[PDB]
Amino acid sequence: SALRVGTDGIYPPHSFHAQDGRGELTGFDIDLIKEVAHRLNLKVEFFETAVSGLITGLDTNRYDVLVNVAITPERQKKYDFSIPYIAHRVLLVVRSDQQDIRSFKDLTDKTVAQILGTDLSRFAKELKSHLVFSHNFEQSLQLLLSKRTDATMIPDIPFFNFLERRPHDGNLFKIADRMKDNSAVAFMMRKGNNKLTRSINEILCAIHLDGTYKKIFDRYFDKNIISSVPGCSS
Amino acid sequence: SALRVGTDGIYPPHSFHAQDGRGELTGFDIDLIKEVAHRLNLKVEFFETAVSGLITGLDTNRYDVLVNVAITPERQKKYDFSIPYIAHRVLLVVRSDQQDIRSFKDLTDKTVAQILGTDLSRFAKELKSHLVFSHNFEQSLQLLLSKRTDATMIPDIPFFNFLERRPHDGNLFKIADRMKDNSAVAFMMRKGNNKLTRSINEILCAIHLDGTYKKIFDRYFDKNIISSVPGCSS
Numbered sequence: 001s002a003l004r005v006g007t008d009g010i011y012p013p014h015s016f017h018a019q020d021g022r023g024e025l026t027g028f029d030i031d032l033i034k035e036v037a038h039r040l041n042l043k044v045e046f047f048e049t050a051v052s053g054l055i056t057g058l059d060t061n062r063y064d065v066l067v068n069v070a071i072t073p074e075r076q077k078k079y080d081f082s083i084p085y086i087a088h089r090v091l092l093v094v095r096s097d098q099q100d101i102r103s104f105k106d107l108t109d110k111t112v113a114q115i116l117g118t119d120l121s122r123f124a125k126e127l128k129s130h131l132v133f134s135h136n137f138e139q140s141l142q143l144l145l146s147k148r149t150d151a152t153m154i155p156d157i158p159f160f161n162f163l164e165r166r167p168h169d170g171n172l173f174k175i176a177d178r179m180k181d182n183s184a185v186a187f188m189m190r191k192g193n194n195k196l197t198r199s200i201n202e203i204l205c206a207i208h209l210d211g212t213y214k215k216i217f218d219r220y221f222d223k224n225i226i227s228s229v230p231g232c233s234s
Numbered sequence: 235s236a237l238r239v240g241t242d243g244i245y246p247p248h249s250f251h252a253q254d255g256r257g258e259l260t261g262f263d264i265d266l267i268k269e270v271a272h273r274l275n276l277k278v279e280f281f282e283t284a285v286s287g288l289i290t291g292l293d294t295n296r297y298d299v300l301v302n303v304a305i306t307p308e309r310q311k312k313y314d315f316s317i318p319y320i321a322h323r324v325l326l327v328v329r330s331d332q333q334d335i336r337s338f339k340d341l342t343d344k345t346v347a348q349i350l351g352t353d354l355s356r357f358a359k360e361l362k363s364h365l366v367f368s369h370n371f372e373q374s375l376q377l378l379l380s381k382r383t384d385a386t387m388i389p390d391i392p393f394f395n396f397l398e399r400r401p402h403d404g405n406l407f408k409i410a411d412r413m414k415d416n417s418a419v420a421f422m423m424r425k426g427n428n429k430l431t432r433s434i435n436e437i438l439c440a441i442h443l444d445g446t447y448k449k450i451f452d453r454y455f456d457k458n459i460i461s462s463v464p465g466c467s468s
């Protein structure tokens with residue numbers, strides 16, 4: 001039988017297409033949930049969904065597992081999470097010549113880009129910027145350098161991914177602040193899916209042990225920069 | 235209304251009594267589970283039991299929550315775990331003069347000190363060592379120093395805490411080897427305690443988000459040597 005998985009499919013390197021959008025669905029999260037499926041003896045079924053419809057696809061039962069979801073207390077209330085399988089940090093990016101903005105605390109009434117997908121709206125309310133949405137990091141960079149924005153807030157994973165893709169890119173921008181603590185990310189299911197949560201959990205543990213979590217991680221992230229999560233025990 | 239917790243209080247810094255064994259139960263896992271407890275408005279009830287019957291004590295409803303449990307696939311099958319809250323690293327410790335123990339695979343035909351009824355103790359039996367049963371890590375370490383054993387498999391948290399409390403023993407032990415990954419630790423519960431698990435996980439999430447986690451961790455660890463788990467998202 002089939003393990004139905006919803007995703008946006010446009011968040012490199014979590015869930016993206018091989019290039020210009022025309023190659024297969026791939027990414028760290030994808031290979032991992034595929035691995036999980038293989039180990040539950042299931043053929044995985046992907047449901048690419050617009051960012052706005054990702055949770056409501058769960059609620060609606062278009063699919064059963066949702067990829068690349070940050071744990072929030074109110075999500076733990078209403079849904080089931082797996083054990084965390086990766087984490088990220090928010091970075092604050094600005095123009096190289098920017099001097100008035102040096103911290104998350106400097107963003108008050110400044111206009112600040114967030115790339116859709118990155119789920120940063122709630123963290124950004126507190127902050128208390130006037131917030132705009134960009135399609136990808138390149139788009140935001142065009143806004144940043146032209147001054148249509150005062151900053152972009154982006155999670156590190158995608159940031160550093162951009163830097164590996166385009167690694168001789170001007171030094172036209174910089175990191176002005178970095179989230180000290182980091183934020184756990186996991187698979188999300190409807191509340192009640194409990195047989196399903198413990199298996200995922202169980203497989204994720206067995207994936208860590210036998211060396212596959214590492215394999216898959218190194219395929220996509222630099223271990224030196226990007227935070228992993230913990231291992232397991234036999 | 236009461237939240238019942240299993241533990242043996244002879245495991246500094248996890249679980250011990252103040253004033254050299256004469257006072258209140260305290261420790262990192264203690265102070266966290268109470269925090270958790272106060273946030274679900276529960277008075278907390280401690281039941282102390284030798285590690286050997288901790289897990290069976292949870293089978294037989296002597297208490298509801300076990301603290302400081304390393305997640306294994308086997309236990310994931312038969313029990314509910316919380317989100318991880320800490321990580322540990324499984325060290326092979328020897329006397330600093332010892333020359334013929336360079337890996338876990340050299341424990342075969344060596345006298346090893348492990349705690350009765352633990353997985354590390356199972357591991358020693360499997361590696362076909364001469365086992366010596368200790369009643370905690372302090373004794374595992376004392377025995378190593380008295381030459382009544384030649385090694386012990388011990389996680390980093392209680393090992394480094396011994397070294398904090400007795401710094402002149404610093405140079406008498408050495409780490410011969412480590413498991414190449416660290417290992418997640420969580421609260422363990424009987425399968426089907428799903429609303430409880432959702433509640434603990436929610437509260438832990440808040441405990442990270444307000445900086446209490448950090449307060450509790452820094453009370454007992456050097457974040458430079460002990461791995462924390464990822465934080466949450468608002």
Ligand SMILES: NC(=[NH2+])NCCC[C@H](N)C(=O)O
Pocket residue numbers: 232233234302303304324351352353354355389417
């Ligand atoms: N990663 C590990 N094997 N940790 C060992 C500690 C877990 C558990 N107390 C035991 O029986 O040993």
